[PDB]
Amino acid sequence: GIVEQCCASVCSLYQLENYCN
Amino acid sequence: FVNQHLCGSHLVEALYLVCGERGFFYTPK
Ligand SMILES: [Cu+2]
């Protein structure tokens, strides 16, 4: 998932918004 | 904005920045 994606690859701040409440 | 390489505590910093008072879930494998 994103914890993996951001670290192993890259991610955007827009992808991170998906994890907001 | 630009793409991010974020591991460990640096990811949770970015989550905090993006979500703020909305709060967020940090859910690894
Ligand atoms: Cu560091």
Author numbering:
A (entry chain A): 1 to 21
B (entry chain B): 1 to 29
What text does the study give?
Hexameric insulin binds two metal ions by the coordination of three histidine residues (HisB10) to each of the two metal ions. In its natural form the metal is zinc, but insulin is also known to have affinity towards other transition metals, including Mn, Fe, Co, Ni, Cu and Cd, all in the +2 oxidation state. In the T6 conformation of insulin studied here, both of the metal sites are exposed to the solvent. The coordination sphere for each metal site is thus completed by water molecules, some of which are weakly coordinated and easily exchanged.
Hexameric copper insulin is found to adopt the T6 conformation in all of the crystal structures reported here. At higher doses no significant changes in the coordination of the Cu I site are observed, whereas the Cu II site is seen to change with increasing radiation dose. Compared with the evolution of the electron density in the in-house crystal structures, the structural changes around copper in site II seem to be detectable at radiation doses of around 0.1 MGy and above. At 100 K, disruption of the water structure in Cu site II was detected at doses above 0.1 MGy. In our structures no significant difference in the first water shell around the Cu I site was observed in the four different structures. In the second water shell, the water molecule next to the coordinating water apparently moves away from the Cu site with increasing radiation dose.
